[PDB]
Design a protein around this ligand. Structure first.
Ligand SMILES: Nc1ncnc2c1ncn2[C@@H]1O[C@H](COP(=O)(O)OP(=O)(O)O)[C@@H](O)[C@H]1O
Lengths: 51, 50
């Protein structure tokens, strides 16, 4: 609703949290096909090489 | 070892999997990973991510 007002597309950050297996990841892709944005998963659990 | 080398390093060779795919010559073999329990989980690049 806000993107519809202030002209162009805009980014923003969000966070989800809750017990595992609630469907978080599933909604991600569903939103991506809602807005028409492309999806790209990127795990970083336990990573340490900033490079 | 699971991913080979860049091919820009001297002596780089493809990771093990390409060799298995090259050898069995099928697209759908039955790979058998062994001893998952004992994967060397070190600082030197964690296979468990790989
Ligand atoms: N309320 C729900 N609505 C839609 N899908 C659900 C719901 N609850 C569970 N799921 C299913 O749970 C599975 C795992 O969800 P996902 O977030 O992808 O993985 P995880 O739950 O491990 O984060 C998905 O296949 C998804 O369809």
């Amino acid at each position: 609703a806000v993107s519809q007002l202030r002209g162009s597309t805009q980014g923003k950050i969000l966070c989800f949290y809750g017990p595992p297996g609630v469907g978080k990841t599933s909604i991600a892709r569903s939103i991506a096909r809602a807005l028409n944005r492309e999806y790209f998963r990127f795990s970083v659990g336990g990573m340490t090489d900033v490079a | 070892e699971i991913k080979g080398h860049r091919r820009t390093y001297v002596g780089a060779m493809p990771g093990k999997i390409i060799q298995c795919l090259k050898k069995t010559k099928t697209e759908n073999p039955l790979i058998l990973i062994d001893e998952v329990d004992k994967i060397g989980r070190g600082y030197q690049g964690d296979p468990s991510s790989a």
